[PDB]
Amino acid sequence: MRNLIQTLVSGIAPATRSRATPQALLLDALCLLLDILAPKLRPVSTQLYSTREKQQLASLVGTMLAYSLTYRQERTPDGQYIYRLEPNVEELCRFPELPARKPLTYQTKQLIAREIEVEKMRRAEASARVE
Amino acid sequence: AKPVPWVEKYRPKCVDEVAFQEEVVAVLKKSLEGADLPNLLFYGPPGTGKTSTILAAARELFGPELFRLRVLELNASDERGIQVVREKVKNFAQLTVSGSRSDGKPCPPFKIVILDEADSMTSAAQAALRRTMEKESKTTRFCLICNYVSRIIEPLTSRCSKFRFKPLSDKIQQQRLLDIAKKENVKISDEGIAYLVKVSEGDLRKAITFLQSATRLTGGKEITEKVITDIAGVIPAEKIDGVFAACQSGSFDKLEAVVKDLIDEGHAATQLVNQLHDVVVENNLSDKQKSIITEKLAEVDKCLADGADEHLQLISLCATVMQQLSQNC
Amino acid sequence: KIRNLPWVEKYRPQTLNDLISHQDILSTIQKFINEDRLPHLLLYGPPGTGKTSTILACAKQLYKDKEFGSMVLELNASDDRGIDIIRGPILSFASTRTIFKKGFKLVILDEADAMTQDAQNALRRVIEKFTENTRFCLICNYLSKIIPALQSRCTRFRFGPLTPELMVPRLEHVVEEEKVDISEDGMKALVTLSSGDMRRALNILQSTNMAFGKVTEETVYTCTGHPLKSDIANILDWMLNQDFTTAYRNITELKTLKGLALHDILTEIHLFVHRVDFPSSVRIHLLTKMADIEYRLSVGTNEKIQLSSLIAAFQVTRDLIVAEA
Amino acid sequence: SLWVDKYRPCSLGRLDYHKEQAAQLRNLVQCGDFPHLLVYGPSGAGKKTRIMCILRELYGVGVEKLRIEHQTITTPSKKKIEISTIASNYHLEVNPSDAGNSDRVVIQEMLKTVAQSQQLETNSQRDFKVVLLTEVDKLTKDAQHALRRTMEKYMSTCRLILCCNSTSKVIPPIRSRCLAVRVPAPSIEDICHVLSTVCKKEGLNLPSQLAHRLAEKSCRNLRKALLMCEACRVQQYPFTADQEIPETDWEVYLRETANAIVSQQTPQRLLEVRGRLYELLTHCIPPEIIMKGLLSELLHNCDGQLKGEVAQMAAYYEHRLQLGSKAIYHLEAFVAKFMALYKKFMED
Amino acid sequence: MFEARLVQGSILKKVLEALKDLINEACWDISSSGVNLQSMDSSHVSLVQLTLRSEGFDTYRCDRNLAMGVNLTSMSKILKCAGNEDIITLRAEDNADTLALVFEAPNQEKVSDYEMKLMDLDVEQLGIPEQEYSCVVKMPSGEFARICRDLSHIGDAVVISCAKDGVKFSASGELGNGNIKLSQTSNVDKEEEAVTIEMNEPVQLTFALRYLNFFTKATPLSSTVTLSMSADVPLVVEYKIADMGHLKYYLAPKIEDEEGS
Amino acid sequence: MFEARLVQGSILKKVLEALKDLINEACWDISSSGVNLQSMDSSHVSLVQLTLRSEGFDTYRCDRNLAMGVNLTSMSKILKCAGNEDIITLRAEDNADTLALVFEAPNQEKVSDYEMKLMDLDVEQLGIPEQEYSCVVKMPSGEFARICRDLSHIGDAVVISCAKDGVKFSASGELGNGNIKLSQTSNVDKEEEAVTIEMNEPVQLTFALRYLNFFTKATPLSSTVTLSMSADVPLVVEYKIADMGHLKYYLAPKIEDEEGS
DNA sequence: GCAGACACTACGAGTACATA
DNA sequence: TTTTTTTTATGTACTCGTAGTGTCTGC
């Protein structure tokens, strides 16, 4: 758990690393962070999303890129691909005997991963255009 | 022309500037004339002037050019293991006493080893100092400085002459603070200086820091009692009366409310223990209730000195005084 | 010639006749030396009683100045005394002959309680094998840190605390050799505050003579900072005779007036708690509370709260003692 | 960027609460001869924001350009230990508690090298450097004893701003050498004003009742209040007055643990509760916060004549936990003592 | 597009060894005049500047002012795989997040390409005042390296004095003082052994040993070395590396002891 | 004012490397006759008596007599960086603590002044008896070093005997015994390789091999060594330097107890 | 005369334990 | 009828692996 905490902390930008200790980030800014990162999203294309849904997706990928969190595909012995966070902070947050909560679907997490990839390349192009 | 904080600007350069520690200052002034300086063990509360006295004595004895050749100052900020005592301290104590003062002032025929903060040294490293102090006493001297004399072993206690630095009385501390405020062109009222010497509790470093910070806060105008109460962290009497009313109520919900309100206001638990202790010893409670409550206050202060949680210790103390106040109701 | 030395090192008993207290032990050691029957010695006792001075006087009596460096191997806690030193320099010193003059050699091991158990186990057959050639003197303050195998091989002498009746003439010799004006109560305060230790009685004498120029009772108790007997009697009378507030005010005024420390007050009140004919249930509670208060003063703890608890430990038992009748 | 970091104030004149303290801190650091500071208060009060505002007031706007620096320190046991450091061109930010019991080796070696050297450029930078020792209450007493002569010798070229939660864990030699600055937690009105200004700058509308409930549930922690407000905005955009506020899992896990304690008093239930306490200690929750949550939930189930005894037992086993090294022994001893007291109270 | 070509592969293979244990990263500033690197250490004591002009390269392409941030631990292992007399081409795209180094194998049969991830570091230029120094002297490079190495076995901090006579190195410790001097060595056949003085005001400043050792780790790039000192300005150690450019080291002095009378 | 001047630095290096693992600290007794050093080892078993003459130095001045006790590890580190063909100046003031070693670099360009802090040990003078010995053997130093190295492989304590025939070495060890006896080896072309017996009464004494092997490290100082033995006085190993002085090693016999049977 | 091979001791590194 | 792993902070002692290095062999 300490190795996972240090791996989560070392990925954040140093401008926001100084604003909170890892202890306070673990106690206060992890479960609420995961509740921020998991909104109610229909499994529909962004094209059919409303302008408000596009703004919510832009805010979601902004706070995903701020903390260097991303979804990647994981293999299972049962034969089904899944999407999981590459820093797996759900085991940092969640507890065994705690009431179940609704997870995001496969289409929504694939949409978030594709959006974070195109947002990283758009950020690279914007930084090339500024410089 | 850089500014310097007043704790270092008003450090005693000579032994005549050290305040209230008359016996050790008289011993060091006799040793300045040529008397046989013994091994020294300075111990007492923080801020009483143990380091400044021996640095002023070393500066008076050796001058500027012989401080690097006659004084070895080791503190807890550097490594003092068994090998540092066996190699570095013994080889320094075995050196010759050469070098004379160029200003014509007399120079003593010994070196000085200032082992500041000797509490942190281990028992083996303190046991390695014994025959180094005894055997090399012709050419060097030792000055152990600590806050607790119980953490220094009894052979080193026996080998050194023990001087206890008392907390500074209100007369000497007030005189020194008024001299510092006169030399800095700042004006402080009598109520302000009375509350300052009440708050500082014999810590002259704390008093100089509070005086400098009150000067910087007000900009150089008159320092009243209100800025001293603001910067000293003193809990107001309304909070203490509310705590005692919550204890006299006998309900634990109001007790939890006032404890959480004092914790959320960031008040230090040591200050709350001091103010509650003053209120308890200065009211009309019975002797048994005062006895039990002051014993719990001492236990709570000991627990806070061991780094326990403030909220749990304060709620335990508040539960004890609530039980005592509701016993007679 | 005049030398700038502390009085605990300027006035050292270079001969066995200058030590004061342990006359039977020193007579036995003198008869060991005069008959050349000196065994492996084990000198133990509290600090400041004259064990290192005893073995240095014996070594200077046994050996001349032209051969002292080849016959005596003195090692202490400032030296490295690991098992490679027992197998190295100590074994080579014990197993070889002398250089200049024929005789038996001496290995002084000062602070023998600081040695590791491996070194103490390696020393056993070095002591037993070369008894004819060399002799060993182990000196310690704590006998429990020396293994029983080394305690069996060395005959042990308990250098107990120096009685104040025999501590006075040596202090008088130091006073008459230093031109110090001292009264009878000053000497009594010196031998009271020393408590079987001649280091602390010389240190206190030198410190008082430098601080004040005279050595009386008031000057000694002011330079040391120790409370007087009358102050402790007043503190006990206030804690047993009146309520919490008046006793607290009087003890606080007495501590602020004279600059007293709570550790010495606790020690003297502990000494007074056994002379006073308390009930046995009261004495157990008082000793437990005073031990707790003494333990709480070893850390960063406010001394005013601990003074209030010291008053509280007696204000608890006031009505118990009175109603016991 | 979250709402905790997007609308953080940059200067001392932009603080929503403790404005008098902001003016006093601006007057304190203007001359440059200010002593070492000890910023203490509850978590989430705004201590680090005020420290960064003090640094802006001292140096330029270059204190916001921070970077990660890695240092390798050799212990006396010759074990190389890696320590991260937030740094700028004017100051450094060190957390020595990441070295644990080796934190003294950070103070004796890494810090003094900072203190013993003057600065490169004395025009863009000022006459002194600042070192921010974060969370000095978690330092061992050896490190705090190594701190004091470094703080006293080189205080004209290196100023220090220690930050902590409780000053009782700081030794009196360190507290004597620094000016203690108390930052209390903001009140309910201040947190409601902060949340209203954040929602207005985001273009949203926030009811007063919802902001009052957020400030009540956050327990005067502005960071947790802002995170809860942003989570409530994410999970439901129309801000209802009775909207369900999300909660942390370890807090509700502590509540369920204390419910499991008070439900049955048996050694089998004690072994289940010990498993729950390992689950809590597994997720890097500090044991004093576990003890505080256990007390705060168990006092809701006790009677009026048992709460003082339960609180005294909690404080006693918390102190014994601080004296020791294995938290599970003292936690299970507290739970077993409470079970014995609760069984005695219920059967009598 | 950043495209640079080296004329000799030994320049990087003698300039990256000093920065291996000195600075934690390499920040290259791309400009029309040349490449600039200004890095401060983690202790905020030492500062490294390296300015290589565009005329010293075989070819140099620069259209936009860019900055690349590379680590040192991977670049040091990449440098040791390269040869000595081979050519090294540095390539960096406008949109990519990596830097490519292409050189020749030591077997001289294949081309080796190594790619490094560009670390996004947020730094600012400190800005040297470039003020007039109170003492400027010239020394041999290898002699200065031997001088700094000889005082390593004596003490952990050295004292540099510079009067009009010459430059005096001292190292006072528990063993004893080691004092060496250099003065008036202009009567030699080689032009690189001329120890000369160029200013007037004498200075005496105490510096650390490890930073001067890391500074003398970059000796054989230049034949001579230049030392600059003043009352409060840091020590400046300058190498004029052939024709491509120059390297500067800034070392802050130690805090002086309380030697009041 | 004391000022000695070694014409070459090799002899001081050989002396301080002979005593490095043996002597704890060097006590140079200074007079107008020369430089004397009588120091025991750390085990108080061996004794070293070095006597260097004033005529062997380049310049030797001594106003008042001195006794300079100094550490040996520091002087060993100073003499490690000293040439074998350079002039080395030892300086000492009247009432100062700095013993100065001034020498030149191996490049023979720059000067080097290394100070040492004198120790303040009060050491009682050890009386050398200077009596007649019952066995005096002149033998080559290299053969003595070789035979000590060859007996170090067999045992640890060696019984050396001497009689009218010659010297004899025995090592009763764990592998077995090794008995090497040499005599009348003066019938060669060389003059250094010769065994000469001068005295009468046979002696047999047992010594440690570690101290003999430490004593044999002065082999380049003298081509011919002298062994003096008797029934009471210790083992003396005398090295006669060519034009500087001499070196005496004293080693005490071990305690050997016969079997009761 | 100089390159290769041999054992030699000094030094760096990992590990355990410390009680009656 | 039941078995894995690193923290405690120094100081010492043991054990083992590695690397300059003095010396011997040979063309």
Ligand SMILES: Nc1ncnc2c1ncn2[C@@H]1O[C@H](COP(=O)(O)OP(=O)(O)OP(O)(O)=S)[C@@H](O)[C@H]1O
């Ligand atoms: N007796 C005194 N006379 C004059 N100034 C004093 C005195 N005591 C303290 N001061 C001032 O307070 C500063 C702190 O004094 P110190 O000598 O460092 O205290 P201290 O005895 O070292 O406390 P500790 O135990 O080390 S925390 C000094 O630099 C002075 O400015």
Ligand SMILES: Nc1ncnc2c1ncn2[C@@H]1O[C@H](COP(=O)(O)OP(=O)(O)OP(O)(O)=S)[C@@H](O)[C@H]1O
């Ligand atoms: N019996 C004594 N007679 C005279 N002076 C004494 C006597 N005992 C102690 N002293 C004084 O105390 C000094 C030191 O005594 P030590 O020989 O160190 O005693 P010790 O009991 O061996 O101490 P420890 O146990 O090693 S700390 C002497 O040089 C005297 O000044």
Ligand SMILES: Nc1ncnc2c1ncn2[C@@H]1O[C@H](COP(=O)(O)OP(=O)(O)O)[C@@H](O)[C@H]1O
């Ligand atoms: N004056 C203020 N106005 C608005 N927000 C604030 C103010 N002060 C603090 N905050 C916010 O409250 C949080 C407090 O966290 P921090 O500043 O790290 O204090 P602490 O160190 O006590 O937790 C920060 O995230 C900050 O954004």
Ligand SMILES: [Mg+2]
């Ligand atoms: Mg101090």
Ligand SMILES: [Mg+2]
């Ligand atoms: Mg002794």
